Amino acid sequence: EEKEILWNEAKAFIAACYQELGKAAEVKDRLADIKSEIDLTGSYVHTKEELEHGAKMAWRNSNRCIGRLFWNSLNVIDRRDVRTKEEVRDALFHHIETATNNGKIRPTITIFPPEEKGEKQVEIWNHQLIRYAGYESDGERIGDPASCSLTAACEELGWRGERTDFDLLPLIFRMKGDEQPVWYELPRSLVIEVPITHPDIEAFSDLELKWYGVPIISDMKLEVGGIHYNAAPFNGWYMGTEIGARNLADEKRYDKLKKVASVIGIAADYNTDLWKDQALVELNKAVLHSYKKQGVSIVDHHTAASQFKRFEEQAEEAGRKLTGDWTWLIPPISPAATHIFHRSYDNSIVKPNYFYQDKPYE
Amino acid sequence: EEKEILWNEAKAFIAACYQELGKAAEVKDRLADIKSEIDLTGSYVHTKEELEHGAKMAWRNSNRCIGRLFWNSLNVIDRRDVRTKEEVRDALFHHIETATNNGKIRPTITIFPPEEKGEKQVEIWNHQLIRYAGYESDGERIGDPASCSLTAACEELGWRGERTDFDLLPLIFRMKGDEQPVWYELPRSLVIEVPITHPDIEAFSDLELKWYGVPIISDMKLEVGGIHYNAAPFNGWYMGTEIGARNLADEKRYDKLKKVASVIGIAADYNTDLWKDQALVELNKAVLHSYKKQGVSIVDHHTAASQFKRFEEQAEEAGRKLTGDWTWLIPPISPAATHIFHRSYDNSIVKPNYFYQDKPYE
Ligand code: HEM
Ligand code: HEM
Ligand SMILES: CNc1cc(C)cc(CCc2cc(C#N)cc(CCc3cc(C)cc(N)n3)c2)n1
Ligand SMILES: CNc1cc(C)cc(CCc2cc(C#N)cc(CCc3cc(C)cc(N)n3)c2)n1
Ligand SMILES: [Cl-]
Ligand SMILES: [Cl-]
């Protein structure tokens, strides 16, 4: 029942939000205003304060995120005013610039107009605002396989990649009323990249690996008080294992472990040599070293787990239930060296939150 | 309802067991016999064939075990005939000898008389038949902290440990009718141990680490067709990470990572150096090397995961549902390098199975 689920979600959110903001006295009148507004318009508009706090709560409730200690310092940019594709493009360029902050990454979310009756106003096709293209033509793989379908969709639309292993995908999004998305090439001056080198092993540079500085997830829906912000890209800084144990290591991604084993001078022939484990450690050491040397924000998984322990402690002190997904919170290397591995977490979904949504292509 | 839950479990087990054994025709008459036997005695006795297959099914259903490919080759020793503490002691000594098999470890279970009306006939106090004692007297910790409470219980009973870091705990068990357990020192000729050395790093021997060859879990209950075998110790061979990433690495166990870091020549000062990860890899390489050199069975986590993949495939081919606990099946180092990490598992409990039971001390 559309309006009823909206009103119910609104009631719960407004009470909780205003409680946290010390505004519990204003809850009654605000709810009155909202109920009338829904009665007449079928929806309601968040105040700037509600929107900001809602986006922060949504991060705080993200069960899969180890980085939640810093939820309250999220930089929230309200772009509910955009109406044109140039305004969207410029807002996304601005997000990249302000989030990057010359390498001292600022966790940031830009919030675009929400869905009206399930009707999107802006529909972003990118998984992240900055990501590498992927290709496969008869056997040979180039670039990031995770981007293969989006890359093909872009090329259908007249974009053409250089077919290096690190082509930047264009921004691609569709406006309400348009049949086709538009795409815009990323200005390279906006995009920080870090070449991967090793602190002790000079030959590591032979692999010619690099990665981009800022992960800006752009395909999830932010839900706050029953309002669906389907277009609301957000970023943090990387935890090193995301690059070194996933993006560059996974067989279905860049698949670099055999090449790493070769440059660090170990055989990749016997499981019992633990060469994959050894290669993973050195690649992950290289990633952290390289970001630190360049002055680009990054966190290692041990430090991240320690920060998360403080998030747990803060939640208990504030009297808030803690929720988490153990399977995503443990790091993909040395998980048992973190406190996370040795406890359990309630995987209940609490709103506001960020949610998956269907891809508009494929 | 005691008898009814027994009869129901018996019906399900006998049908399934006889189906798998190609004996489905005999199900009807066997069930008749069983129902009469329960009617008169309050319980029933498994045939040797039922007991053997039941113990194998129980391993096959153990959601937390990565080693299940080899479920059908379990060596089942029927000791339902024991009545004296000397017979129990001798059976446990025999299990150690036959399971060890001069280093070519045989997965084995010895099954003692089952509970009658919840009344245990034999109650084993050990967690494993072979394990090291642990102590703490005013600040200083010696040996395995996981054994502290059992060690104290043994010493209450007149045992005294030498207070090395590797004292073998005695076998300790209680017979029905006795108020106190009895204990027996392990003959050292029965116990294989492996000194830990590193394939390339000579200084690794300075740590004076060793571990025992065979993990023989002795505190779980085997449940088959509603019969509760509370005393039924079982063993496999080790996966290397159990020793190198858990027993010797955990802060609440032997806690050796800083010492490992020192002997491999790296600083243990900065999280971003990933020294814990590097130390874990070298310690785990050392463990595998040392067992292999001595001719004691062991498996690495990559090979184990590959075997488990074949277990999954075999289950599907046989038309059996697969159950598993993802949180225990992933190895504690490089979990994302295994296929296990990238799929999900149904954690449903299926019987026959092995279950936890309350400790008789503490
Ligand atoms: C500040 C630095 C941050 C770090 C280091 C961090 C770390 C991570 C990591 C490691 C993951 C899991 C990735 C994986 O499993 O491979 C994750 C997931 C997630 N993070 Fe964070 N995060 C940060 C900031 C943020 C921010 C600012 C938000 C939103 C406002 C956010 C929301 C999420 C969400 C929604 C997921 C789950 C994504 C999914 O289901 O695919 N994080 N984070
Ligand atoms: C043949 C070699 C075997 C290997 C390599 C193996 C491997 C393992 C591993 C790695 C674990 C998890 C340990 C941890 O999380 O730290 C485990 C758990 C388990 N294994 Fe196996 N296993 C083997 C044989 C057996 C046998 C023969 C049985 C029983 C007949 C068995 C039953 C179990 C059970 C019940 C658990 C869970 C124990 C608990 O809940 O504490 N395994 N196995
Ligand atoms: C069990 N862990 C598990 C399981 C599955 C099935 C997927 C993933 C990874 C999901 C995922 C992939 C990619 C990429 N590329 C980026 C992300 C963004 C993660 C993220 C988001 C933000 C905002 C900051 C930050 N540092 N990191 C998530 N993990
Ligand atoms: C998430 N993984 C997780 C979580 C918790 C809370 C505990 C454990 C470990 C349990 C455990 C501890 C110790 C010892 N010492 C031996 C075992 C026996 C494991 C075992 C049993 C057998 C038969 C063979 C074999 N190779 N290994 C289990 N794992
Ligand atoms: Cl990423
Ligand atoms: Cl063990």
Curated annotation (Swiss-Prot), chains A, B:
Top-level taxonomic group: Bacteria
Pfam families, alphabetized: NO_synthase
Cofactor(s) listed: heme; (6R)-L-erythro-5,6,7,8-tetrahydrobiopterin
Biological processes per GO annotation: nitric oxide biosynthetic process
Details of cofactor binding: Tetrahydrobiopterin (H4B). Can also use tetrahydrofolate (THF) in place of tetrahydrobiopterin (H4B) but binds THF with much lower affinity than H4B.
PROSITE patterns membership: NOS
Tagged with keyword DNA-binding: no
Complexes and interactors: Homodimer.
Entry similarity comment: Belongs to the NOS family. Bacterial NOS oxygenase subfamily.
Protein name: Nitric oxide synthase oxygenase
Taxonomic source organism: Bacillus subtilis (strain 168)
